[PDB]
Structure formats: structure tokens, C-alpha cells
Symmetry: D2
């Protein structure tokens, strides 16, 4: 019997007394693995009210004590790593190796954030008035909320709750309805170690109902969400009503520029890895590849072979595959239509391009050639493992085409010339630029997107600061 999950509100699991449930399906087999409540705004309010009641006492605790609580959580996660990884493989459809890395990374990330306890600093500013001290303190926002995507669902729990809790905020999280199981497991760990009630809450439901309440409740100081630009818009519009602060990461269409003087072998490996990450269901990955004439032929051949070797299938029954199924039916179709439109517009299928039919949602790695910068596939977040390629003559062309997008989170370039490198760095309008390596943000970096890719950001010192606000005290004599 598929387990029916409870919500975690005010320090205890609460059994859902509603009649409506939401089935959680294994994207590899389409089987129902669990059910979660079709939560309502009322449920989100209970979690928010509990978070509000606990916040003052939580912020009053010395930062090192909050860090202490965070360390018990990551220790609990490591103890149940394999269990949590299987939950991720099962509901998220990602391969075993990737799931294991996500759990381990999540625990390391939580520990890294806990280390900020004695380090985030306020400032003392010189005043123009004799005998006056201007003291700028860094305070918690209060109650914060997090809306998570189905891509890297476990890690994103930490990416939002760790910085939030460390700085003295309390939080209410809503997992994606497609991947709530790993979040339930995280909540169990929180319950087991005995985190003060109300500090961490987990509400389950749809974005339309629960999600909106998390963004529009007047007691929320900040709503943090990762997902599509479309959903980001809805969240910011809702937050507008109460001047609620937002932190959004809305994905992108990561450009990869391969120059003629590039280490061909290295570039092909980096691009293939980035793109085929989590079947490409990620944003990080290169989704737009620009190769200049001089190395085109060679590059496209190796890339074509590299991708043909990529095997796809059920993550739970095969550990020798580099790709699992897409998240759900809608995702699969969107990819089909986008490849079809691409082909109808002139794109040349050099590999794949035909959705598999049967149990699960699979799309073979696809390589589209003779694509033009104008083609819609170059201006629409894809989803699946599809790699469009465009040739160019000058660096200026490549940079200009990379910047021709409403997204501005990640970018990459491969070259060995000093001026080219510094030119790409200065010219690319992105939150991140990887040079001669694959795309994967460091926990001490700052993952923040330009243009429609987001507002605010995550990770590192700057990510931690998204959860702090200033109080400037003018102390006279």
C-alpha cells in the first residue's frame, strides 16, 4: 500500500484529515509510490503561525547554538544516506550515483553554512557628528518560506533552510508535489534530533493553494523559490501585495562557447556531462552550444559519439546508465514539441529526436545541427537532453549570441588565449562563467541569475546575507 504522508507543523507530524490526496509517481514505471495531502492555505497558515511563535526564542539563541542544531541535522542525514538516496532515485528519476552525491553534498552544505555562525559581521561607521557612533547590525528577517523544485529536491531544502536557520530565521517549506518523499525524510530527521518546535515546518500541496499562501501571507518576511520563470512571476506578483521580499532562481539556457584553440577533448567531456546532468532536467547544464568554424567539424563529431554512448533507463534497476526518465508526462511532451518545432524550422537531427513510447518518460539524447540563433529552441528552456549547435566566426559573435537571452544564470567558454578569456569574462552578461571546466557551482560561490534567471541568490556569504537585514543605530553620546 502506498504510504500516505503527514505534514510537519509546530514540532510534530500532523495527520491529514482531508479527503483529497495527490499521488506521487515513479517516473520510471509510472507506479504510485506514495500520497501526500492536497494541502490548503489553512495548513500553510498553521505552519507560518508556529514559525512566528518560535522565531524570537530562536533568534535569541547564540548563533553557535543554532549552528549546533544544524550539525545534528547533517549528521542525521549522513546516517540515513542510502535510504534518502533511494527515495530520490525512486521519485526524482535520477541515477543512483547522482542521488548519492546529492545527499552527501547536502550534508556538507549544511555544515558549511553552520560555520557562518561567528562570522557574519555588522559594521561600525564613522559619523560626521562629534561623539556619535553609527552601528549597523545584521538581524534575521523573521519567518521565511521556501518553495522547492523537483530537480535536486533534497539539496534545495538545505540551500534555503540552512542559511535561514543559521541567521536566526524560522522557516516553512513546501516540497514540489512531484518529489515530497525526500522532504518527509528530512523532516523525520529534524523531528528525531528535537529541533525546537516551529523552527522548521513542512507543508504539502500544490503551488496554486499552499504555494500561494507561503508567498502572500503578511507574516512572511521573505519567500524563496526555485522553479520556472512562469511560476516565479506568480510568486512575485503575490508577494507584491504585502511588499514581501523575494529570492528567486528561475533556471536558464546556459551557453557554452568553444573556440578553435580549445582543448577539444576537455570541452566535449565538460559539455556532455553538464547537459546530461540529471537527464538534462537541470538548468546548470549547457543548453546552447556555440562552436566556431575552425573546430566545428571535429567538435561535432566527437560530441556526437560521446552522446551516442549515453544509455537511459530505470535508475533503480541499472547503475550503468547516465540518464533516467524525465519527471512526468508534460515534461516529455514539451521536449517532443520543441524538437519537432526545431526540425520544422530547419534544425538537423544528427542523433535521437524521437521520444520513446511505453512505461516511463524517456527521451534519447538528441543533437540538433544547423540551428540558427533565431530558432525558438535557442530561446526556450528545453527540459530534456537536447543539444542545439550553432557555428560562428568571431568571439564577438559568440558573446553577442550568448547574451541574446532572457536568462542570465550560467555560461561557459573553452580557450587557451589570455585576451579571449578576459574578453569573454568582461563580455558575458551572466551570474556565472565557467572557463575550461564543467558547470557546477561551489558552496562558497554565489549562484545568482541575471535578467529573468532570478532575484537575489544562493550559496556562500552573499547567499547567507539574503537572510539578513540591517538595523542602523545612531547612538549619540
Amino acid at each position: 500500500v502506498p504510504v500516505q504522508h503527514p505534514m510537519y507543523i509546530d514540532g510534530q507530524f500532523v495527520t491529514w484529515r482531508g479527503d483529497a490526496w495527490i499521488d506521487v509517481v515513479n517516473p520510471a514505471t509510472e507506479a504510485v509510490i506514495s500520497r501526500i495531502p492536497d494541502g490548503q492555505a489553512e495548513d500553510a497558515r498553521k505552519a507560518i503561525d508556529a514559525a512566528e511563535r518560535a522565531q524570537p526564542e530562536w533568534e535569541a539563541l547564540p548563533a553557535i547554538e543554532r549552528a549546533s542544531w544544524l550539525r545534528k541535522i547533517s549528521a542525521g542525514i549522513r546516517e540515513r544516506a542510502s535510504e534518502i538516496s533511494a527515495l530520490i532515485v525512486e521519485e526524482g528519476g535520477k541515477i543512483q550515483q547522482l542521488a548519492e552525491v546529492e545527499v552527501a553534498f547536502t550534508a556538507d552544505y549544511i555544515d558549511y553554512m553552520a560555520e557562518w555562525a561567528r562570522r557574519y559581521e555588522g559594521e561600525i561607521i564613522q559619523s560626521d557628528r562629534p561623539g556619535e557612533n553609527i552601528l549597523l547590525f545584521k538581524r534575521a528577517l523573521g519567518v521565511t518560506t521556501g518553495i522547492l523544485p523537483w530537480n535536486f529536491p533534497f539539496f534545495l531544502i538545505a540551500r534555503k533552510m540552512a542559511p535561514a536557520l543559521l541567521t536566526g530565521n524560522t522557516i516553512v517549506i513546501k516540497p514540489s508535489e512531484f518529489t515530497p518523499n525526500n522532504a518527509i525524510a528530512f523532516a523525520k530527521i529534524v523531528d528525531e534530533i528535537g529541533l525546537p518546535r516551529g523552527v522548521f515546518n513542512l507543508v504539502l500541496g500544490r503551488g496554486e493553494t499552499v504555494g500561494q499562501e507561503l508567498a502572500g501571507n503578511p507574516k512572511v518576511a521573505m519567500v524563496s523559490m526555485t522553479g520556472s520563470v512562469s511560476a516565479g512571476e506568480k510568486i512575485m506578483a503575490t508577494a507584491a501585495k504585502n511588499i514581501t521580499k523575494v529570492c528567486l532562481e528561475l533556471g536558464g539556457k546556459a551557453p557554452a562557447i568553444v573556440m578553435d584553440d580549445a582543448d577539444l577533448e576537455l570541452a566535449v567531456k565538460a559539455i556532455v556531462d553538464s547537459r546530461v546532468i540529471n537527464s538534462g532536467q537541470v538548468c546548470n547544464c549547457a543548453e546552447r552550444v556555440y562552436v566556431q568554424k575552425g573546430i566545428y567539424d571535429q567538435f561535432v563529431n566527437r560530441l556526437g559519439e560521446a552522446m551516442q554512448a549515453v544509455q537511459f533507463g530505470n535508475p533503480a534497476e541499472r547503475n550503468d546508465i547516465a540518464m533516467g526518465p524525465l519527471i512526468n508526462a508534460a515534461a516529455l511532451e514539451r521536449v517532443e514539441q520543441k524538437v519537432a518545432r526545431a526540425v520544422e524550422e530547419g534544425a538537423r537531427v544528427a542523433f535521437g529526436g524521437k521520444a520513446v513510447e511505453g512505461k516511463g518518460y524517456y527521451y534519447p539524447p538528441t543533437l540538433l545541427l544547423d540551428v540558427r540563433q533565431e530558432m525558438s529552441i535557442m530561446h526556450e528552456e528545453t527540459f530534456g537532453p537536447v543539444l542545439p549547435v550553432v557555428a560562428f566566426d568571431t568571439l564577438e559573435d559568440a558573446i553577442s549570441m550568448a547574451n541574446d537571452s532572457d536568462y542570465g544564470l550560467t555560461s561557459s567558454i573553452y580557450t587557451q588565449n589570455l585576451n579571449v578569456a578576459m574578453k569573454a569574462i568582461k563580455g558575458l552578461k551572466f551570474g556565472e562563467t565557467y572557463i575550461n571546466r564543467e558547470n557546477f557551482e561551489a558552496m562558497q560561490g554565489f549562484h545568482a541569475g541575471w535578467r529573468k534567471s532570478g532575484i537575489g541568490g544562493a550559496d556562500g556569504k552573499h547567499g547567507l546575507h539574503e537572510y539578513l537585514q540591517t538595523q542602523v543605530v545612531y547612538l549619540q553620546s
Copy 2:
């Protein structure tokens, strides 16, 4: 004949070819002093497109050269100080002394911001990968827009354009339709010194038309606006459509806490000054005064006398007055209704409380006693010069009541006890807390409101950073 103003777009003044104009009235006499175009979205787009065309070349200039341009602007302002001050007195209705201070301060502020040129710094972060350098650069957002309030209209031009231009952004500003003259004067200075075309643009019109385009045009990287919470909501909702970043300062209801051990003389002077600033048409000013029992009687008596001496009248014909008229008819009525509701709810008029009838919009300083924390006047931004007073027993009561508000920009407290001070500091949930002095933010501070008072902030290093975004470069080998 009342002058008809042109807009300043792409380095030149452009004559309005529309049939509709908006009269600009002297709030002291109700006479039409000038007319501005009833600009449309089309006009805002032309300014934005010009700003976009000029931004790359502008950001490419070394920061010290941009600072150089800013210094010519402030030098131009000082040269025309008296002329600009009279424009402010005439349209804003503020007293001569205040107008002169605003112009001088604006010039000093611009110079202070220009000094950041060689000082805003990016960072170099240690990587976990051998031979890798993580470089975090600080880049311009691109095209930014500013929507100004009628309160301190001249200064707010600089508060937004100086930080914006210094960091390499270009800008399009829309003055309040009630106070555009001082903005036209600022534009003339910009034209005279020859600032590169497109860097600074001035569009005129209503919030409904021009303002909305400045917040919803996809080419805008950030919209900065100062005004009412109501208007802030409209702006954030519009920005939501394109995930446009916002910087909002929406005023407040500044609480002042007077303890028994307070320097009575100092406190009364600070509160009266803060409140009667610009006839109280400002947000900074204390709008909620909490006095504890032990010193109540004394405090209320002195405050009552201090306010009775405040004279009001035409700023242009009297330089011996501490107060001018309110901005317009709507403002006057809103104050009347709020005082009437206050009285009907139980408030006790100890002074004033009766709107003057005749040419201009005047409201005498008013003191309301026996007010309860519940009374709507304690939860509604007032406008005019009205001071509600509430008694209390403990510091805990005072702090709790100060925090009982949807606004969280400024606060103040007067005491001589070390623990009380540190307790108020830790307990008050505001962006600013003044201790034993009047409310007036320093240019090197950070004016940023909590809760509904805003998003982001202005002034100092942090204010400058609102106009910067990061680019993290992962340079491998």
C-alpha cells in the same frame, strides 16, 4: 504665462507634441506655476531605448571617469543653488531654510557617491579544486529607472542617479507630477555639462502611464521608487511580469520612546523637529510618541508649548515660519478625516485639530492625547503635522507597541540607562534606531525599511551595492 516643460531624452530636451498637459500648482496659493506633458508609455520607451544604447559605452568607462562626470553635476547644482531652492519652495511648499539645505545636501551626496569609484570591490574566493581561481566581479545592472516622490524631490534624484551612474548603469527618471520643476533644472545642468547622451533621462507624466512603463519594460534591470505602500504594491506587481528587480522605500509611522530617565529638554526638541520636518509631509519624522507615566505630565506640557509656537504660512513670503502648506487638496482632507476619526474614537485634542479654510492647504500642528495603541491613527501613515501620544509603564510595553506596525523604517528612544539602550536596540524591529537625537539619516548610513517600509535600500556602501550584481568566474588552470 506658465512655462510648458520638455522631456529630456537621449541627450537633448524634446518638445511635447501632445494636446494634454498637467498643471503644476503652488500649494501655498493654488496658482499654476508650470505645465508638464501628460507623457505616455511610448515616451518612457524612447528614454529606456536611449539608456540601453548608451549603457555599454558608459559601463566601459573607468569608474573614476564616471565619478568625474558626477562631480561636474554637483558643481553645476551649487552654482544654481538659490534658483533651485526657490523652485523647490514654490512647488513643494517647503520652507526656504529646508530647501537650501536639500540642494546643498544633494550636491554633497553626489560627491560622496562619486568617491566610491575606486572602492567598490569584487572578491577572490578559495576553491576546493587544485589550480582553480574563483573570481567574483561586481557589474552594473544595465538600465535602471527611478520614480520620485514629491517629498525631497531634488535630493531623491541624486539618491537614485548618483549610485546608479557611478556603478555603470544608465537611468531614466520620472519626477512626481506635483514637483517636476526641480527635476527639469537638474536635467538642464546635465545637458549643460554634456553628460554622454542616454545616460540620464527625464520623462514626465502620471504614475498610471509613464510610471508603469518604467517598472514593466523588459529592458529595465531595476526599478527604484519612493512613495506610498499603495503605489509600491502596483510597482512590484508590474515588475513581477519580467522578474524585474525592485528597490522600494515606502515610508512609515516612526515611533519615539521617551523613558522617565530621558533628557526631557533634548527629547522634546528632537521630536518636535523630526515631526514638523517639511510640515510633517516626510516619513522620517516621529509619528507615534510613546511616553512613560513617570515623565508623561512634564513631557506633554513642554511638547504642547513647543508646538504652539510653530507658525505656518506661505514659504515664499515668510522666512520666519517652521511650516508650509501640505502638498495638495487630497493630502489636506486625508489629514482632516484621520484626526476626525481619531477624535470620534476617543482621542483628545490638546492643540490644533482644525483644518484652515482658504487659499492653500494648511493644517495646524496638532497634538492628540489619551490615544490608544488600537486607534487607527496609530496604524495609518498620517501626512500632516499630527502627534499622537500614548503612555506606558514598561520598556517592554513601549517596544512591543513600537513593533506593532506594518512599517519598519525608523525608530527612536531617549534614555540614559545602559541596559535600556541595549535592550531597545535589540528589541526594536526597524531599519534605523536613533538614540538621544533627532531622526536624520547620514549619507554613509543605510536607509532601508523592514516589513512594508520597503525592499532593498539607499545610501552608503549597501545603497551603492543595490546597483551592482555579481559575476562569479570559475577559472580552471
Copy 3:
């Protein structure tokens, strides 16, 4: 048989082949507990040469990997806590409770410093030249050395080696000849976990021989030493020869100011604790107490009783004592002479003032009254548990007398008035000022002395930076 210790050079313990040894005596019984080599400059050079050979590979390791090595060390220390604490009790003569706290704190300190790995940052500076990037990196100094005092010998090992190793430096440490056993234990832990050879070295001997080579060898980038001003002078003079950087902490004469409006109970407890810390053999402790007239009588009475209860004796056989013996004979005599001079100059013995005669080196807690700011005892680091008291009328007097010293490390004041507090803060010329609490620096603070108390400092971010130097790269195009 008293064990004869080997030195730890280039990743292995090396047996001393000299004929001269130095006896290490238990200050409580005068019994020889161990022997260490009378090392020579030659020995220090071997350690330095090994440190030099290992430094490039050590700095080349990602910072997180160095932090990883530091964590194995602290984990090793916790595993042998009681063993190490007894070594400290036995040779240092400090009470069991204090020794246990020192070991635990040392392990926590090492962990805290390891956390800086991904956080110390370089900077990116705006240039005046078009297309130029100014990159300021933070690099290791290279080979560093540490000369430790006999007071808190175990902790000081970490205070110098943790920051040094984390930032990529290698180090050579020389323990005080009076307390080398705990250092040998630390070296065993380093050997057991397998820290790369040459990174941590331990050389044994006298300051005249080994110490001087550690300060004057041209391969040393920085010498860090904690001890007396006299020894600090010798070290800086030696370093002068090769322009070697120095980091010195030379103790002090910590002033404590008790106002009339002070929490009498709290103040007496804080002062007694601070002073009687490690029998007063520490610098931190208040060594100059200024009490104003109004509260004098009361304060002196309670302080007198509080000190009379302090029991002294053998730390190893009594766990109900607050004080152990002084480090050695010379220390005991210096205290006697200073109290005698004090008495001969006019000081009034209100308690103690008579050195005990017999096995060990004990001096009873002593209270000297009617002391004048001029008396030499107010301008000479004492050593033992002696508390001189001086009365005063105004805060200005107290501050002026507190600043009348060649030392400027720590200070303290007790009051409840806001202005007094801010006045003391602005007026006291010290590296630290404690208000209404006892003197004990936090690991995230910055323990750095003014005037003759030192050069540079330790702990926190600034302490970590003492081990880093900048490399400014001007990258054109």
C-alpha cells in the same frame, strides 16, 4: 626515571644526541618530571629547512584539505584530553578544572580556524585604466615560527599553528622550556594522524639558543612569540636583521574600573576570577583595580572576603582549590620583592603579603590598599595573585590612570550609565575593553595589544590575516 624527550623534525621524532639536558620541574613539588634537549641553533635550522621543503606542496593543497588535516588534529586532542590535561597540571601548576578547559578550548579553537578555509578572501579592485583588472590575492607567508610562553602552553600551540597551517604556511614551534611536555603530546598526535612531513615541527631548548635562531633565520617569513616585553625586545631586534615580520603578545597590567553605580556583586566576582586565573600567572586578569570613593568601602570589603576564601595547593592532589603554585623560584621572588617594595612605598597589606616557605612556589592571594598611581606596583607586570587598589572621584581620573601604562592589551569597566559606558569605550586606549563581565577573549575576537603589549595579534579573522600577505596583480587586457 624521568622521561627524556625527542624533538619532532621533518615528520619524525628525532632522538637528541647531545650531552646537555634541561630538567622540567613540577612547580608544586619541585620534582623532576622530564628532561628535554638543550637544543642548539643547528637543530632549529633542520626544522626550518624541513618546513621550507614542505611549504610549496602544503600551500598548493586546496584550503579545505588543510582544514581537513587540522580537524584530525583536534579530534586526536579530544581523544587524549585527560592525559594532556594532567600533563598541563603537572608541569604548568594550574588547577585541574582550568587544564581541562584549556584542552577542550584548544580543540574547539583549531576547529574554528579550520572553518576559514573557504572564507578568507582576496579582492578585485576597480582600475583607472580601460580594460585592466586589478586582482589582489591573499597568499601564505611561507615558513613561520612560534615561541610559546609557559602560561596556557597547550592552547598557544594552536593559537599560532592553526591559523598558520590553514592559510598555507608551515611552522616550527619552540615550547617554553618550563612546559614542553604538553607540546610533545601535541606532536605525537600530529605524528599519529600523519600530517605531511615538515608542516609542523617542534624544537626544544632555551630562548638564547633555539629561540634566537627561530627569529633570525633568513628563511623565516614571520616569527610569532608570546612572553615578556623583555623577551619581545630581543626577538624584534633579532628579526630586524633580515626584515623578518613579527607578531608579539607581551602581556600587560589590565585595569578594572568600578563606578559607584556598578553591580557590586557582579564586579567583585569578575575581578576575583580574572585575577586569580591560573594563580594570576596570566596577563588577561585585572592587575590594577580603580574603585571610586562612593562605593570604595563596600567594594573593598567584599573583595577582601572573596579573596580570603581562595585556597592554594598542589593541583594534582586537590580539586577543591582555586590556585596552584607559581611557575618557578624566580617568579616567586619577583612577587615578594614587588610586594615588599609596594609596602615600603606606602602600600597597606589588607590580606596575604607573605610568601610561603617550603616545597613548591606559593604566594597567597594579596590585597594592597592605599596604593598610589605612582607606586611602581602599578607600572610593573606583577606575576602572582596580587591586587592593588586605588580610589578616584571622576571617570576622567579613572580613564586617565588606566591609560597611564606602557601596556595596552586589556581593560574593563563596571557601570550602568549609558554615557559612562560610551565614554569609557572612547577613552580607554586598549586592544580590549570588557564591560560588566570578566576578562576572557572570544576565539572570533581579536586579541591584539596597544603600545608595548604587542605587534599584530591573534584570533578571529584579523588573527588569521596575520598569516597572509597580498599579491596585487595588474592584468592589462
Copy 4:
């Protein structure tokens, strides 16, 4: 009649009443242009005592007011630019164009430093104790002293006094006995604008007498000096006596690495300019040139021609020369001997190498080829315009040879390969590394030498911080 200069002590010029004077000679003609007193320790003490008396009131002034005083000084300098430049040309022997740039730069530098007034910040640190605030303030050191070199004598006055005064310190400066005239002019400006007495003092004399008192007087918080390593040693040894902080810049032997893939034209121009700067009497300049085989022949030919065009002569009578005379007789001889030793050791004179005989001290630009890394000329600060060249095969060789020096201030490299650049950056052990451009530090950078090149540093934020020390306040409840 050669003017006899007075000292500037305690806000007024003081006429020297001694019998001994020191002649100041024009290095181009050997004529006596002026005389200064042969000051004694007594004179230095009077200046120091006056600085001490003025410091408290000076530090008590708001920082912006100190910056205001600094701006009057730079404004005064610009007003007398040509007059001051001629003084520099006359006594320093540098060409007119260089002197004019030094004066203008000095005024800009002073203004840049004044801008730090409202920007240097203290910090607020999270505590482990409930209710405690850890406040770290940045305070002035107190009285500081500056010992200036004869190279860039005017600028170095500002490099030390501007940061010192801005942060609240007072200062006593001793110009080089070879170039005191420009310092007298600076003092006149200070007197004319009316800087508070005691804040800026100028004492004249020899290093042996006046210089030593400035480094060894117990009231000096920090001595800052720029000169030779030999003199730096004497200063640090003297400072050691009172644990006085030091800030030393002792020059170097700047290495220049020219790769085969270097922009030959650019490299030759950069090296020739750097080296021939102020006749090479500067440290900045490349003094060790490493050229790899592949481009050797070409590089050496162009460099040889470039240097042959360099004309030398009297700076005052020729404005078409790139080089003036060396500072004095001793300098000239030291260069002769070093070139002679070089030749005797195997060096090949490709140009120059013969000191001119007659009025003045001239040495023609000299190019030495077939020099070996072992040759003493590669390990001895030269002085004059001599360029030794060494060939190499690998980058590793070049880096290793560049690092083979006791000096570590500046370095440079020319290449177009990305990996080479990043490799040189990581491999070069210097305070500065210039890439594809000439050596000239920016005012916002940080000029600080590694190894024997110095201690501490100058310019930018870090340079400003050399004049600040911390006060950590632990405020409990």
C-alpha cells in the same frame, strides 16, 4: 646666497640656532642650492611632544573634518605646482615631466585618501554569550613618524601623512637630507592653510641623529620609512627597544619575464620606461630582465636600440631628455663598481658601461648581456640605469630565477597564453605582478613588499589600515 631652512615644529617655522648645517646640492651641477640644520634628537623630541599634545583633539574631530583639512593641503599644492616641480627637478635631478607628474599625483593621492573619512569600518561580531555584543572599533595609533627617501620625495610625504592624518594620527616627518626643499614647500602650504598645530611637523637632519629618535622615542606608535634595506634594519632594530610598530618599504630588484609569445613591441617599451624611470634611481623599475631563447635575439636588438636613444643631462636646461643625473657621488661610484664587477665576472657590455666624468653625476644607460643568474649584479640593488639580461628555456626556469631574490616587491611578465599568465601569477612570490604593461602602482592598490622588501605597506584601503588599530569591546547586557 643659498637659503638656510627652518624646521616646522608645533605649528610654526623655527629658526635653527645651531652652528652646523648640511649643504643641499644640485646633482646636475654640484652647486649648493640650500642648507638645512644638522638637527639633533632634541629637535625630533620637540616635534614628537607637540604631535602628542595635538593628537587627542585631532582624533576627536569627525573624520570628514580631517579630510577637509587634507583637501586644503592638496588645493594648496596644485596652486604652487610649477614652483614645487622646479624644486624637485633642482634637488632630485629628475626630469621636468616626471616632476610635474609627481606633484599632480601627490595632490590627487591626498584627495583620494581624504575620501576614506566616512568609509573605514569597524565590525560587529556575533558572540557565543546570550545578550552580548562584540564591537570592534578602528582607532588611531597616536603619534606617527615618517622617514623619507630622496626618490619621489614629495609624493612620499603624502603617502605617509595623508593616511596618517585621515585616521586621526598626528605625524613628524624627516625628509632625506638630499631632498628637503620640496618638504619645506609642503610645510609652508600646511602653515598657510592653518592646519591645527602639532598635527604635521617637519624635522631636518641626518638619519643617524634625527632619524633614530623618530624610530626610538617611546611616544611614537609607529615609524614608517622608505629607503635601503640597510637603513631599514637600523630602524627596525631601534624600534625593537620600545616595541614600536614599523612600516618599511625597502626597494628591490624587479624581475621582468618576456615569453616568446609576447608582444615584442609592447614589452620593450614597458621595460625601457620602467627602468629609465627617474634615471633608474627608483625601485619599481625592472632591474632583472629574463628573456626566453625563442625571442631573445629580436628582443635584445630592439631593447638595445631603444636605450641608445635615451639622452641624459641637466633636467633644468633640457626638457628633451629622458634621464637626469644620479643623486650623488656615492651613488655614481656604486654603479661603476657594480658594472665593473659584472664585467669582470663575465658580463658583456652591449651598450654604455662607462661613467661620465665632469660636473654632475651621470651614468649612461647600460645593457649587460650573457649575464648569469649567479652574477652578483642579479642580487644587488643597482641604482643607476643598468639592464642585465638572462636567457631561459622554460617558464619554470624564469619563475624560479625571479623568486631567487631577497626582495619581493614588484614583478612583471609578458605573454598571451592563458595558462602561462595564471601560472606566473600563482608562481611569482611578489607583492605585485604586472602583466603586459609597465610597472606603476595605482593609488587604490597596495604597494607592499615580500621578504626583505618591507613590512606592512602603502596605498589603498590596506595602506590606510596600517594607521589604524583595533579596540574590541565586549559589551555584556
